[PDB]
Amino acid sequence: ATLPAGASQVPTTPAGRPMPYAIRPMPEDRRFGYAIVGLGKYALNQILPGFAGCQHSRIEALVSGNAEKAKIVAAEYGVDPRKIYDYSNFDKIAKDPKIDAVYIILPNSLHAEFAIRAFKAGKHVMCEKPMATSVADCQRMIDAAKAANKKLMIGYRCHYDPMNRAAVKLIRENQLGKLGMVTTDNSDVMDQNDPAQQWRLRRELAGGGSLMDIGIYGLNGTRYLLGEEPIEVRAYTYSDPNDERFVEVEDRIIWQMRFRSGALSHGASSYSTTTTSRFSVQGDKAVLLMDPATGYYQNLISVQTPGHANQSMMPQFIMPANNQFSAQLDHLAEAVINNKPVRSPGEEGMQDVRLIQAIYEAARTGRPVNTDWGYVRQGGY
Template sequence: MADTSTSLDSRRRFLAQLSLGAALAAVAGAAAALPQSEPDPMKTTDSAKLGYAIVGLGKFATQQIMPNFKDCQHARITALVSGSPEKARKLAREYGVAEKSVYSYENFDSIKDNPEVDIVYIILPNGLHAEYTIRAARAGKHVLCEKPMATSVEDCQKMIDACNKAGKKLMIAYRAHYEPFNLDAVERIRKGELGKLRAITSDHGRPVKPTEEKADVWRVDKKLAGGGSLMDIGIYALNAARYLTGEEPEEVTAQEFSDKSDPRFKEVEDNIHFTLRFPSGVLASCTSSYSYAEVKRGRAFGDKAWLDLDPLSDYYEHNLKIGDKEGKREPKLQEGNQFAAQLDHLAECVRDNKTPKTPGEEGLKDVRYIMAIYEAARKGKAVKV
């Protein structure tokens, strides 16, 4: 992650090259599902909804985040921030955003004078999260920031401190905390449906193609990404192990392998396998990769039954299976809009002055564990956390 000293020239070159491919997106404690309540006429009018400024108009922002505002009861888009004026103006017309509320990265700080903006959603490469979170807080705005929160523990703390100093909320976009299938899995584990939890496995992989996908260029740049597959998609496995167990790991081990003859992995890692040991004795075995076929799954094993989420962290079409000595079954669950639920949750927290379910401290924990995993892989031995 770039800190506040990131040069304007380098940022301009980066934004021009990529048109800001969005950071993707991989839940401490069992977060209760955000209910899709009946619309409240007093809260569903545009004037009653809190305004979001979308910072970064890459693929994830334009194809996933922005379209899902249509299902929000408490949030709407009121500003856009982009390095591409033409693209921003086109999207502004599509989403009914006033031209005066279209910003560049150079004049971003003037967003402080826009009363239509309550929350800034930062959907930038990891290396820019800290800078824009801090600038948003100084502009007097609440912040929703994509994960990983930052590329260092120090930057995470700076983000938390900046928002605290400004008296503003900071929430990290862990959308799985608001996704019905994941939340149902957590509830079943807590109720003891699997018996005593013994182990967890989770695998997340996607092949990066920086020569074909603009959104993948920054992912293989260490300064902008902070790391490779672990930072980008392994974080889903890491976070899932924490929210499925409801515990914090006390020790990590890891192994990493990257083919350095492959130009994609000259700066960042490809394959990494890490294990988390929890206080209850649960072992979580997790993998992330930038070279094997796309997978986003997780499984929890108890002494009575197992539970499978495949996919665990996809955008849509989730699936949950449970197996025991009686056989396998698929509970009938209704797909929910995790994006809208997440956006509405922060809006309600701002309106009601409540702490978000996934605050900055949640993001800090994952980054701290990620750094411990990297250390364990380098040293070839277990690292206490």
């Protein structure tokens, strides 16, 4: 009965020790510089604070219209003041080699714009969701990327969230069986007094109501969970005509879709009901419930069968995977380096916009809108 060699071989005095075991993502290099456009809610609450956890990304320069603020932010994240661009001279970034790409976090209407401008600035483009307010504008963004021979990546963080990935994997391993019915719901009360929620009420900047903003989650979700595209869609929308919030954009809208596989889906988004992010995938062996489904934190999934409910969630002491944000940032830096295609290409953001427009059309005409245009997902969902 004797103690292990390693143990007994430890200096009962101050001594140097080896690299400890990594039970969570350790910082590596920082060879990718980002140009963050629009210092808004998402940019300052979830994106910037998510760089610290990156393994290959850094905030090289900011791009804000507000000076007082922009300077303050630059301090908190320690960015060279001489590198605080704006909407006027955003193009000058092409004169800095330390700017590998830009991350546009502006209202949907301004997405396409600064993307193309950025592409000519010889930088990679990471644009937020939804890609743009126009199908065509999405296409122009792509073309620009190809002309400038650069990478185009939309901000689909759920494509890099551990639980969402585990969700796709269990479904690919056929744990639910033959897929037949998906149900999604994404909701949160619209606050008109919130600076970030105002341009969302404006059909010009937003490009749509809840669907364009959060219903896109269920739409996108339904797509990568099923692992295929809708071939047909129907939809109905409605908003309280007395509510000033939805004069231009829609509050609630419900869409039904069919897939070549034969599977059906029905989901909805809302601006008048509180926090809801719930996905449901039904197969003939089991049903998957993701609730939370697409949150920033605390996502939880469960596979249910009579008498059983197997749940998954981030461990309580370890982090076998990085958070969606950092993972997303380093996903571009990583696609550039090893010269690989991104999982969230502009081609993907475009597909969502078409389908959304197809939906709005269905809601407008009250007829089904054929969406069998032959889109193909590059690199699987």
